[PDB]
Design a binder for this molecule. Sequence first.
Ligand SMILES: O=C(Nc1cccc(-c2onc3ccc(-c4nn[nH]n4)cc23)c1)C1CC1
Length: 234
Amino acid sequence: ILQHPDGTVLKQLQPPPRGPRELEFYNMVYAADCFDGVLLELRKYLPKYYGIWSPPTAPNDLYLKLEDVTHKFNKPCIMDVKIGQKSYDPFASSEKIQQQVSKYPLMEEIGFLVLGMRVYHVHSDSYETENQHYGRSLTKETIKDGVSRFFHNGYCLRKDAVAASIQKIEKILQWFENQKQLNFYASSLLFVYEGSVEVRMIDFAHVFPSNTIDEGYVYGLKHLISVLRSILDN
Ligand SMILES: O=C(Nc1cccc(-c2onc3ccc(-c4nn[nH]n4)cc23)c1)C1CC1
């Protein structure tokens, strides 16, 4: 992800088939002639899409030009959470499945995984960053405190941001409970609040057509909501 001063990010397409699939996802959703009510509603929860972009002198080098969801914040606190019970998609080989489950074998049980966070701390005027090993170390016993860490800002627990996060996730969940045409694997929610709220869906390299509720995504959202709700009682 390259952050551009104009308030966009450039995401380089991942190698095939992932990058092409994510391109086609955005293209389908943001199709100019799209009057699909499900897909029109979905646009609210995605980064705004500005189309494919490549350097003037390098047509080979493919990027997605996306809204920088963090742009309107002064000191954004950012958390990336992968959603679902399965991080592998319906066409994964046995080895791929093993690889994906191996990465975090608690995915089925918990239904989400923290990919990272950047938390601005007022006292130090500095950022605390957690990498992918942070979230992959969290268990059922430590997930609540694991998530809570994100909201430690301003000499307090930011229950305002926690409550707002629940409210925004709830709308995304309502979307999922009213669609049966897309299933989402290894996609994320990006949480942003002001450290000095946004909750958006990102990362669509494994989005597939379906004829069922995305039950794994729904489970993940519901468990995430339940954890955040518990944090409100701290
Ligand atoms: O700091 C983090 N992430 C971060 C930071 C700054 C900006 C963004 C960001 O803003 N808008 C985005 C739109 C799409 C995507 C995106 N799409 N597929 N992968 N990333 C990322 C985006 C994300 C994580 C916690 C460690």
